[PDB]
Paper text:
Here we present the structural and functional studies of SCARB2, a functional receptor of the important human enterovirus 71 (EV71). SCARB2 is responsible for attachment as well as uncoating of EV71. SCARB2 is ubiquitously expressed and serves as a common receptor for all clinically isolated EV71 strains, CVA16, CVA7 and CVA14. SCARB2 (residues 37–430) consists of three domains arranged in a “Kidney” shape.
To gain an understanding of the molecular basis of SCARB2-mediated uncoating of EV71 under acidic conditions, we solved the crystal structures of the ectodomain of SCARB2 under both neutral (pH 7.5) (hereafter denoted as nSCARB2) and acidic conditions (pH 4.8) (hereafter denoted as aSCARB2). In contrast the elucidation of the structure of nSCARB2 (pH 7.5) at higher resolution (3.0 Å) and its comparison with aSCARB2 enabled us to visualize a pivotal conformational change in SCARB2 induced by pH that has implications for the function of the receptor. In contrast, at pH 7.5, the re-positioning of α5 in vicinity of α4 and α7 blocks the membrane-distal end of the tunnel, decreasing its void volume from 4,867 Å3 to 4,554 Å3 [calculated by program HOLLOW]. Thus in nSCARB2, α5 (residues 157–164) adopts a short helical conformation. Helices α4, α5 and α7 are held together in a compact cluster by hydrophobic interactions involving residues W146, L152, I156, Y163 of α4–α5 and I184, L187, I188, F191, I195 from α7. Under neutral conditions, a cap closes the entrance of the lipid-transfer tunnel of SCARB2. Amongst these multiple sites, based on the contour of the electron density and prior knowledge that lysosomal enzymes are often modified with Man9GlcNA2-P, the glycan at N325 of nSCARB2 was modeled as Man8GlcNA2. N325 is located at the bottom of a cleft formed between helices α11 and α12. Man8GlcNA2 protrudes to the surface out of this chasm and stations itself in vicinity of the cap. Notably, the sugar moieties adjacent to α4 and α5 are stabilized by P314, E145 and H150.
Numbering used by the authors: 37 to 430
Write the structure that this text describes.
């Protein structure tokens, strides 16, 4: 019965893997900074939440190649974002948001450790730059031209003048994956054996932290059980995470197990100590330093409103109001199929900010992990895809 779900050009699992039937949505949430100058002079930051802005993902797998014997498959996954205005607050082309000036914050990082050179820091003093900027929502995620980057682009053309959170992530696959089909065992269904041609991460300080575990997270192995733990590799998150069983749900007419991301994942603990790039020093519970993943930028990952995290971070930034129900990330999956009936996946992007004497752009600013944006990656099972799926046996 389990044999029905494998990835091979005959099965229905494949056609639904190749072109996933269910629509998937990402909603974007920005924190609009209230007191920019007051922040620079050392006062507590205060933000206002702005969102969502709704984009429907267009998902198909490409460059599908076939296994050693029958046991492996490899491909890339192209996701594109199609904006839905009526499910969003406004038109992100018009709508404005004020936050940290991120492009300059990285080159400043690039000043202190030299990923490009210090002393071309000159461009910073030649052209006045602000640590807080205003750009349309469309601009921050889909890209805009920065004036510092534009100059630096002249001396070294490899660096792009364009900054964006999601810049050039429309329509493109991340990474080359090779995947384990269900032939050796169902348990290995859509497991990640290797990514980008390397089967491990080189980013993290220990052997265990650097492992690539489990599925990409958009599917699971059939015949799931309440006791076990499901590993997931979120490429964009720069590491692998697992989920623990929470409660029993009924989506549609069908059973589901609710798995959640346990607070342990981003917490400060001796198992997690490798996620500190300096070793013996990491920032604390509930935040991760994802810098090496992103071009040397001082970018911190956290859950929305710093949920599942030390509350000293929550205190530092006004307007952070973490609650479980909204900011948790959960997966409701069908025990038999392992198919995902409903889920919501939520990460937050933070930027590390501190006063530097070498740069007056930073003023007297407090040392803190500063919220820019978080997102809900969500999926719900349609009511006629429910019953065709509920048509089993056979
Ligand atoms: C989130 O996560 C991020 C990563 O994911 C974190 O990012 C990390 O942040 C830490 C913060 O501490 C940072 O560590 C620092 O690194 C500094 C940079 O190190 C490199 O550069 C220096 C200096 O470059 C200059 O080197 C000499 C001159 O000093 C010259 O010969 C060089 O060519 C170059 O000079 C050139 O430029 C000038 C112009 O400026 C020209 O005029 C000149 O002609 C030259 O062209 C180097 O010394 C370093 O070398 C080390 O590392 C390489 C790696 O390959 C080794 O090969 C090398 O042997 C050496 O290794 C060891 O020596 C250093 C000696 O400083 C020791 O620190 C250590 O034992 C090394 O293992 C690098 O090439 C660095 O300067 C700084 O250290 C300073 O402060 C400490 C304070 O204790 C002092 O003791 C030192 O003496 C230094 O003054 C510190 O180590 C990481 O680099 C950074 N990593 C990444 C990947 O980003 C981020 O922090 C995190 N965020 C949060 C919030 O947690
Ligand atoms: C993707 O992720 C985002 C963010 O997590 C979700 O957006 C949230 O959606 C939830 C519902 O799924 C919203 O929750 C509702 O908020 C309403 C507004 O509450 C305000 O008003 C009350 C007092 O009236 C204040 O106390 C509060 O602080 C707010 O200022 C509530 O009225 C709703 O309450 C109803 O449901 C709850 C359920 O617990 C009951 O307790 C209530 O009695 C009542 O029945 C509810 O709390 C939330 O506001 C949304 N937030 C944002 C930022 O948009 C998306 O839903 C999620 N999924 C998708 C598909 O987008
Ligand atoms: C996030 O916070 C920032 C900072 O508070 C905020 O940016 C500001 O938005 C307001 C609009 O909400 C901008 O004010 C407008 O500026 C233009 C250009 O000068 C004017 O034409 C506008 O005047 C009209 O405004 C009303 C109608 O729109 C009328 O009452 C009025 O008579 C005029 O017709 C208006 O003054 C302001 O320029 C920006 N400020 C900065 C620094 O960007 C942003 O809107 C916030 N985002 C969200 C989603 O709330
Ligand atoms: C991301 O790329 C996709 C793919 O082109 C865009 O989706 C299309 O957008 C056009 C509007 O220019 C419309 O025809 C539809 O919304 C999409 N086309 C089809 C055939 O579905 C999407 O607009 C792009 N988004 C951004 C932010 O660049
Ligand atoms: C990847 O998976 C391996 C095992 O599947 C994890 O290693 C285990 O970590 C736990 C920590 O509680 C230890 O008790 C086990 O002894 C470890 N097992 C093995 C075989 O090493 C590893 O931590 C996972 N890493 C990531 C990043 O998900
Ligand atoms: C699956 O369907 C037929 C089988 O020959 C073929 O036209 C198609 O290219 C196959 N696809 C893959 C990825 O093998
Ligand atoms: C696939 O087969 C079984 C199922 O878990 C296991 O013993 C084996 O190690 C799996 N292969 C890989 C590469 O994980
Ligand atoms: C992280 O944990 C270790 C051991 O539990 C502790 O020594 C260190 O102070 C902690 N740091 C933070 C920021 O919580």
């Amino acid at each position: 019965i389990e044999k029905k779900i494998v990835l091979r050009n005959g099965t229905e699992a494949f056609d639904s893997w190749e072109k996933p039937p269910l629509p998937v949505y990402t909603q974007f949430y920005f924190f609009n900074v209230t007191n920019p100058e007051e922040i620079l002079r050392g006062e507590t930051p205060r933000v206002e939440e702005v969102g969502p802005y709704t984009y429907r993902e267009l998902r198909n797998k490409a460059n599908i190649q076939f296994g050693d014997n029958g046991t492996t498959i490899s491909a890339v996954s192209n996701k594109a974002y199609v904006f839905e205005r009526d499910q969003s607050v406004g038109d992100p082309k018009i709508d404005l948001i004020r936050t940290l000036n991120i492009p300059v914050l990285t080159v400043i990082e690039w000043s202190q450790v030299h990923f490009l050179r210090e002393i071309i820091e000159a461009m910073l003093k030649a052209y006045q730059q602000k640590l807080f900027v205003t750009h349309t929502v469309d601009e921050l995620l889909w890209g805009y031209k920065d004036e510092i980057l534009s100059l630096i682009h002249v001396f070294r053309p490899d660096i792009s003048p364009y900054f964006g959170l999601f810049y050039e992530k429309n329509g493109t696959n991340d990474g080359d994956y090779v995947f384990l089909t269900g032939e050796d065992s169902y348990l290995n269904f859509t497991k990640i054996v290797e990514w980008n041609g390397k089967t491990s991460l080189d980013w993290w300080i220990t052997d265990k932290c650097n492992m690539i575990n489990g599925t990409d997270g958009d599917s699971f192995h059939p015949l799931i059980t309440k006791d076990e733990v499901l590993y997931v590799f979120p490429s964009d998150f720069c590491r692998s995470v697992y989920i623990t069983f929470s409660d029993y749900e009924s989506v549609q007419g069908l059973p589901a197990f609710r798995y959640k991301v346990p607070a342990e994942i981003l917490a400060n603990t001796s198992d997690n100590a490798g996620f500190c790039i300096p070793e013996g020093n990491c920032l604390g519970s509930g935040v991760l330093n994802v810098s090496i993943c992103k071009n040397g930028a001082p970018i911190i990952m956290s859950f929305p409103h710093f949920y599942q995290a030390d509350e000293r971070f929550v205190s530092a930034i006004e307007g952070m109001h973490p609650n479980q129900e909204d900011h948790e990330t959960f997966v409701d999956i069908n025990p038999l199929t392992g198919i995902i009936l409903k889920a919501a996946k939520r990460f937050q992007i933070n930027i590390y900010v501190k006063k530097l004497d070498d740069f007056v752009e930073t003023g007297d600013i407090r040392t803190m992990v500063f919220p820019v944006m978080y997102l809900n990656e969500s999926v719900h099972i349609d009511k006629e895809t429910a019953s065709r799926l509920k048509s089993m046996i056979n």
